[PDB]
Symmetry: D2
């Protein structure tokens, strides 16, 4: 079946890439970066995030795999030393698929726009253009809070180990179909009030951020960060779409969390 390999582009990753391609030549197995059915990422988690966003229109037709050339990421998942074993396993068709939830982000504007929709594997965040940051937070059409602070982060389950974590969020097992909202430096006094706690939302729950003042926002979706102007609504929900992984071997989520934060 058709595959492609992205590389971080340093000496180590390119050489491993060329080796795997040569390895794949002894099977069938066809290189195709337009319509791959396997996408192998070699580098780190940032490399892996770029690979996902490259093929974010073909998610239902692709199974991703990551190899880490340094740490040990949460998306890659294979050591360089295991590259040969992986070539043989991929070529044999010797894998089950595992799916992780994604986050759908919708930015609505005033005319012209032309709403934009984004898909995130880690998180989307919102901050001001700089700028006091003030939004009304609306959960399933009901006004929940007026947030004043530095911004908000909405994380997928596999994104919980990233930005979500730095902000005091929970780590959620990625079999849970949910998104998690954390505060960045909320202001709380006797007049301005936020929940404080991170909030975890199931599928079909919609979290809507609405401008109070100030309709310009710096919005991030994984690595991408853009200033959006004349924003009417930022709308968060668990995507109907999933990312599929090829595995292969047991490497439990909590073991990855252990290895990354406790040690090994």
């Amino acid at each position: 079946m058709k595959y492609m390999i992205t590389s971080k582009g340093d000496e180590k990753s390119d050489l491993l890439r060329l080796n795997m391609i040569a390895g794949f030549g002894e099977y069938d197995m066809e290189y195709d970066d337009v319509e791959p059915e396997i996408v192998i990422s070699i580098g780190g988690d940032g490399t892996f995030l770029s690979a996902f966003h490259q093929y974010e229109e073909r998610l239902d037709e692709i199974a991703f795999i990551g190899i880490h050339t340094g740490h040990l990421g949460f998306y890659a998942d294979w050591r360089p030393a295991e590259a040969d074993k992986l070539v043989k396993l991929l070529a044999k068709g010797e894998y089950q698929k595992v799916s992780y939830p994604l986050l759908k982000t919708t930015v609505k504007y005033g005319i012209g726009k032309k709403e934009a929709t984004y898909l995130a594997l880690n998180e989307s965040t919102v901050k001001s253009s700089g700028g006091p940051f003030v939004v009304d937070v609306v959960i399933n059409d009901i006004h929940f809070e007026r947030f004043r602070g530095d911004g908000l982060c909405m994380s997928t389950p596999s994104g919980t180990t990233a930005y979500n974590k730095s902000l005091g969020g929970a780590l959620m097992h990625p079999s849970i179909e949910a998104m998690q909202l954390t505060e960045m430096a909320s202001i709380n006094n006797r007049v301005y009030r936020t929940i404080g706690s991170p909030l975890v939302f199931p599928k079909h729950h919609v979290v809507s951020l609405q401008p109070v003042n100030d309709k310009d926002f710096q919005i991030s979706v994984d690595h991408l960060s853009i200033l959006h102007r004349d924003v009417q609504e930022i709308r968060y929900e668990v995507s109907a779409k999933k990312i599929h992984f090829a595995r292969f071997r047991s490497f439990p989520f909590w073991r990855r969390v252990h290895d990354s934060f406790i040690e090994d």
Copy 2:
């Protein structure tokens, strides 16, 4: 159908109880506190927790309802002024059922014991007998961390608004079948290391606490707190059992959270 009413036992709750009983006399509707199919709690959330634990062997045959005589709890849910409307609605059989996940706790001992199993609607916690507190945390048979601190809290989704919240935990929608673990005053230096973050676990995941030193622990299950001696394992998992509520009207979880923490 058979019902019973528990009261907080102050003047206000007893009178509302007697009124509802009189109200129920005009229907059928039979009072029975041994095998009720409806359990109405009048008081607060503590009243409601006592009602659940009274009937924790009959959960699959009961639908609970709470009335709050002060605040506004997360389990009750009806204002005293709505008592008459509720009598008519209960009597008519005019309700759908909503189910919340429960937490199963297993305490294993050395001979004699005779493991004990407990069911929690809010949380179970563990602290020392007093006492440095040190446990090994084992997730699905794999050693995750050695926790040193004041204790650990394992919360259900509806318990997230309680003890879980005070500890920095996430608020989780109770449609999510999960349990959440938070730290109490963890010790972290270059030698002792915990994850820090709260952890959210799906069904079938098992979290096991094992003594390092020190086999005596003060274990809480909702209101109940007991010193357990010669403990070999404390085992946490999402229960297969659920609590059923009678509703009635829309009162969304996030609206309850809003009313309780933001205002109204």
Copy 3:
């Protein structure tokens, strides 16, 4: 003695300003905004911060007073209804002086620059140009940590109720001659490590931030926020300079904290 009055510039503040000026005409008391000995701020804390920064070269020759036209700020301190009583008290010379510590910030560059020095009443912060943020933190010439995250905040004691607070910092009584450093969304895993906790530093302690990558930083000093380029060092220390307040009456710091965050 010579005074001046700054106003927030809304209807309420301008009218109170003109009234106080008329009131001051019945005494002596001379209006002078070039070399005032009394600076009265009417508005909020932002108004007060602007007044301080206007006269930050004459601090040793000035006594500040704030009037709040809405809340209740930490710098103002007088209700509009008390304006007449304040005119008489100021004119009589009926006040003792109270001094608060200030924060000195030094930004060093590569040639050309021409180091810049700034004085802060609340805090100075550092974030990236956008941009992973990574700095080496050096305390009294010794390398303390490599910080990776969103930024750092260094707060004076009276600034602790502001940005410092949102970040998890301690509230410090302003009689303590100290500065406090908090983290913004620090990254911590088995490889990247920060202290986590806020750090409180006495006089003469120097905290130095040094670029790792990336020599461009968005630096704030109270309201002012500038992108500095080709930065070699950001240097934090308790200033030798103090701000002087005129009081008047007892309004204890902890009472102000109570009124602002608990209620009243």
Copy 4:
């Protein structure tokens, strides 16, 4: 001059103790554990805390030194390998003295008692007898907050690296004459309100905890933890008394913090 040595009482500490005593025999230098002028602690920080509490009536006449037989504590401060060098230095009278602030705790009761006063080098804490914990917090005679939660911790500056830290407190340089108050699992909703933040208090500020319900409290002072009954007031203040250290060499506080929490 007269000295004494306490040991942790394991094989390693006793042998080092006997060696130092033999070493001290070649000077003058007299062993006296009733009225020592030098107290050397060999073990860890717990060993050191016991040594301080042994001689807490003679603080003004003593200079303490700690040797750590494992880690690296904040009070000891010398490696076993440096024991000989330390004997010679102590015997020569080749040291300046450094003083750290202490915390005075006063427990007032109803008749009989007979107030008790305690001195803490790390912290004093308060929790319930078990037991919802509810106290009124009164700062300099003014009611600041009604705290509901698990307890409160009041830490000295050198205690900030201990229990204070686990609770989210600031690390304070021990040249600052201050005490710091942190919350343990505070309850906060629209009805019950605490400050959240840690509070840092200068000398002469008095923090008073008063029972709301419930006059029984589990009070800790460093290692000591006692249930006090029929309590009317717990009163916290920076002590007029200081602990004196013998040094010797530069080992800056922030370097100790680095070594203990970052690495080395």
